[PDB]
Write an enzyme that holds these catalytic residues in place. Structure first.
Site, PDB file in Angstrom:
ATOM      1  N   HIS A 113       0.815  -1.197   0.000  1.00 48.40           N
ATOM      2  CA  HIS A 113       0.000   0.000   0.000  1.00 48.40           C
ATOM      3  C   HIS A 113       0.851   1.250   0.000  1.00 48.40           C
ATOM      4  O   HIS A 113       0.665   2.152  -0.810  1.00 48.40           O
ATOM      5  CB  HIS A 113      -0.916  -0.058   1.203  1.00 48.40           C
ATOM      6  CG  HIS A 113      -1.778   1.151   1.381  1.00 48.40           C
ATOM      7  ND1 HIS A 113      -3.123   1.154   1.104  1.00 48.40           N
ATOM      8  CD2 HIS A 113      -1.494   2.390   1.846  1.00 48.40           C
ATOM      9  CE1 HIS A 113      -3.631   2.338   1.410  1.00 48.40           C
ATOM     10  NE2 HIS A 113      -2.666   3.113   1.861  1.00 48.40           N
ATOM     11  N   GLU A 114       1.813   1.316   0.909  1.00 48.36           N
ATOM     12  CA  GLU A 114       2.630   2.520   1.000  1.00 48.36           C
ATOM     13  C   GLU A 114       3.441   2.760  -0.242  1.00 48.36           C
ATOM     14  O   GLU A 114       3.557   3.886  -0.704  1.00 48.36           O
ATOM     15  CB  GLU A 114       3.561   2.459   2.203  1.00 48.36           C
ATOM     16  CG  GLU A 114       2.821   2.387   3.531  1.00 48.36           C
ATOM     17  CD  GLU A 114       1.782   3.473   3.654  1.00 48.36           C
ATOM     18  OE1 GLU A 114       0.686   3.156   4.146  1.00 48.36           O
ATOM     19  OE2 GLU A 114       2.029   4.623   3.221  1.00 48.36           O
ATOM     20  N   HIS A 117       1.599   4.515  -2.762  1.00 50.41           N
ATOM     21  CA  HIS A 117       1.708   5.958  -2.579  1.00 50.41           C
ATOM     22  C   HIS A 117       3.052   6.487  -3.048  1.00 50.41           C
ATOM     23  O   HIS A 117       3.105   7.534  -3.688  1.00 50.41           O
ATOM     24  CB  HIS A 117       1.534   6.349  -1.128  1.00 50.41           C
ATOM     25  CG  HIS A 117       0.165   6.122  -0.558  1.00 50.41           C
ATOM     26  ND1 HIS A 117      -0.997   6.485  -1.193  1.00 50.41           N
ATOM     27  CD2 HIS A 117      -0.202   5.635   0.654  1.00 50.41           C
ATOM     28  CE1 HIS A 117      -2.020   6.219  -0.391  1.00 50.41           C
ATOM     29  NE2 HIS A 117      -1.567   5.720   0.743  1.00 50.41           N
ATOM     30  N   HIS A 123      -5.723   6.788  -2.741  1.00 51.04           N
ATOM     31  CA  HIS A 123      -6.537   5.728  -2.207  1.00 51.04           C
ATOM     32  C   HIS A 123      -7.653   5.357  -3.121  1.00 51.04           C
ATOM     33  O   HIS A 123      -8.198   6.188  -3.845  1.00 51.04           O
ATOM     34  CB  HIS A 123      -7.126   6.138  -0.878  1.00 51.04           C
ATOM     35  CG  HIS A 123      -6.123   6.110   0.228  1.00 51.04           C
ATOM     36  ND1 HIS A 123      -6.124   7.027   1.246  1.00 51.04           N
ATOM     37  CD2 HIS A 123      -5.099   5.264   0.483  1.00 51.04           C
ATOM     38  CE1 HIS A 123      -5.133   6.751   2.079  1.00 51.04           C
ATOM     39  NE2 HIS A 123      -4.487   5.686   1.641  1.00 51.04           N
TER      40      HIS A 123
HETATM   41 ZN   LIG Z   1      -2.684   5.078   2.356  1.00 47.96          ZN
END
Ligand SMILES: [Zn+2]
Ligand SMILES: [Ca+2]
Ligand SMILES: [Ca+2]
Ligand SMILES: [Ca+2]
Ligand SMILES: [Zn+2]
Length: 158
Positions: A113-114, A117, A123
């Site tokens: 997830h990170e 980013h 998101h």
């Molecule tokens: Zn996030």
């Protein structure tokens, strides 16, 4: 938003959580990068000195960016979008208990997830997406990006 404008991306593990074996941190992070290189032209390489594009940090509370962590629970990690300096960097809240498995907070899943980013994703509203804001353990050995995630990252790369 911003995206990396080159294919070879480096990362460096700034420091290691005491929650895990060192080799397991290395592997979780490596595998998390692979999730994204699997579906883009990006190539990720760990470096052990110097300035990486993506610095991986474990820290707690206030840790020198403007974005303090909140102790156990809540925010697990955060990362900056592509850019110089702190851009790209991924910070994991040391007040979580990072693991290789379903106990605590799974580092690999969080890192996927990170790193999303770090590559410029925001998101997703789809609970099936790894980029959904909410952490949910799914079997890491069978893990796959949702079509939503693949569509997201392939909107930026490739
Ligand atoms: Zn996030
Ligand atoms: Ca950086
Ligand atoms: Ca937290
Ligand atoms: Ca910890
Ligand atoms: Zn931070």
């Amino acid at each position: 938003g911003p995206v990396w404008r080159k294919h070879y991306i480096t990362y460096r593990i700034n420091n290691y959580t005491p929650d895990m074996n060192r080799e397991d941190v290395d592997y979780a992070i490596r595998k998390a990068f692979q999730v994204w290189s699997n579906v883009t032209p990006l190539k990720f390489s760990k470096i052990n000195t110097g300035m990486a594009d993506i610095l991986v940090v474990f820290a707690r509370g206030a840790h020198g960016d403007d974005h303090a962590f909140d102790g156990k629970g809540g925010i697990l990690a955060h990362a900056f979008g592509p850019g110089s300096g702190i851009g790209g960097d991924a910070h994991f809240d040391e007040d979580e208990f990072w693991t290789t498995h379903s106990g605590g907070t799974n580092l690999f899943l969080t890192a996927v997830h990170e790193i999303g980013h770090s590559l410029g994703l925001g998101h997703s509203s789809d609970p099936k997406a790894v980029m959904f804001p909410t952490y949910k353990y799914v079997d890491i050995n069978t893990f796959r990006l949702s079509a939503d995630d693949i569509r997201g990252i392939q909107s930026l790369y490739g």
